[PDB]
Amino acid sequence: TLAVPGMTCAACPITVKK
Ligand SMILES: [Hg+2]
């Protein structure tokens, strides 16, 4: 469901790329 506990998955590693 949208963002998830982990991120960084050839999907949003750029979102929480921090
Ligand atoms: Hg991700």
C-alpha to C-alpha distance for 15 and 8, rounded to whole angstroms: 8
C-alpha to C-alpha distance for 1 and 18, rounded to whole angstroms: 21
Output the CA 3–ligand 1 centroid distance in Å. Answer: 7
17 CB-near residues (< 8 Å, 6+ apart) = 8
- Whether 11 has a binding-site annotation, put simply, is no
End-to-end CA distance of the chain: 21
C-alpha to C-alpha distance for 2 and 6, rounded to whole angstroms: 12
Residues with CB under 5 A from ligand 1 (ion): 7, 9, 11-12
Output the CA 18–ligand 1 centroid distance in Å. Answer: 12
C-alpha to C-alpha distance for 15 and 1, rounded to whole angstroms: 15
Per this entry, what is the length of the chain? 18
